[PDB]
Design a protein around this motif. Structure first.
Motif, PDB file in Angstrom:
ATOM      1  N   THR B  21      78.850  -1.859 -37.426  1.00 29.48           N
ATOM      2  CA  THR B  21      78.770  -1.568 -38.847  1.00 29.48           C
ATOM      3  C   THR B  21      78.930  -2.848 -39.648  1.00 29.48           C
ATOM      4  O   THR B  21      79.493  -3.832 -39.171  1.00 29.48           O
ATOM      5  N   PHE B  22      78.369  -2.837 -40.854  1.00 28.63           N
ATOM      6  CA  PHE B  22      78.336  -3.994 -41.736  1.00 28.63           C
ATOM      7  C   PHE B  22      78.699  -3.581 -43.150  1.00 28.63           C
ATOM      8  O   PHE B  22      78.566  -2.419 -43.528  1.00 28.63           O
ATOM      9  N   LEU B  23      79.164  -4.544 -43.934  1.00 30.44           N
ATOM     10  CA  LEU B  23      79.328  -4.362 -45.368  1.00 30.44           C
ATOM     11  C   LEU B  23      78.409  -5.342 -46.079  1.00 30.44           C
ATOM     12  O   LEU B  23      78.533  -6.551 -45.872  1.00 30.44           O
ATOM     13  N   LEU B  24      77.484  -4.836 -46.896  1.00 26.67           N
ATOM     14  CA  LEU B  24      76.484  -5.660 -47.569  1.00 26.67           C
ATOM     15  C   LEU B  24      76.671  -5.612 -49.072  1.00 26.67           C
ATOM     16  O   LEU B  24      77.050  -4.579 -49.618  1.00 26.67           O
ATOM     17  N   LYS B  25      76.408  -6.734 -49.734  1.00 25.74           N
ATOM     18  CA  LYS B  25      76.516  -6.854 -51.182  1.00 25.74           C
ATOM     19  C   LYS B  25      75.129  -7.022 -51.793  1.00 25.74           C
ATOM     20  O   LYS B  25      74.298  -7.765 -51.263  1.00 25.74           O
ATOM     21  N   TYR B  26      74.878  -6.316 -52.897  1.00 27.26           N
ATOM     22  CA  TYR B  26      73.671  -6.486 -53.697  1.00 27.26           C
ATOM     23  C   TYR B  26      73.986  -7.104 -55.062  1.00 27.26           C
ATOM     24  O   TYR B  26      75.022  -6.809 -55.667  1.00 27.26           O
ATOM     25  N   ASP B  34      75.345 -11.358 -49.885  1.00 25.35           N
ATOM     26  CA  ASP B  34      76.461 -11.618 -48.987  1.00 25.35           C
ATOM     27  C   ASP B  34      76.569 -10.461 -48.003  1.00 25.35           C
ATOM     28  O   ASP B  34      76.166  -9.339 -48.314  1.00 25.35           O
TER      29      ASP B  34
END
Lengths: 49, 34
Positions: B21-26, B34
């Protein structure tokens, strides 16, 4: 299909996506790979026709 | 991988992907920063 009207409370069937509201012109930036939009918790916040 | 090796030695990087799993920023423009 029919003609689309903005800034009046209408009901819309955008490609099987049924919803209600007032449409207006958006200063947001769709990239060409984008198909539609949503913002938070599966509510379509912007759509490109 | 396929090369247009002219008749006369090229560099690339390969890594293997894994499920997690990942945490992505828009940003504002709907793109990833990021």
């Amino acid at each position: 299909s029919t003609n689309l009207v903005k800034n009046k409370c209408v009901n819309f069937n955008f490609n099987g996506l049924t919803g209600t509201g007032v449409l207006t012109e958006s200063n947001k930036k769709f990239l060409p790979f984008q198909q539609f939009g949503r913002d938070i918790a599966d509510t379509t916040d912007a759509v490109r026709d | 991988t396929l090369l247009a090796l002219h008749r006369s030695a090229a560099a690339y990087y390969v890594g293997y992907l894994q499920p997690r799993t990942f945490l992505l920023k828009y940003n504002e423009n709907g793109t990833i920063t990021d």
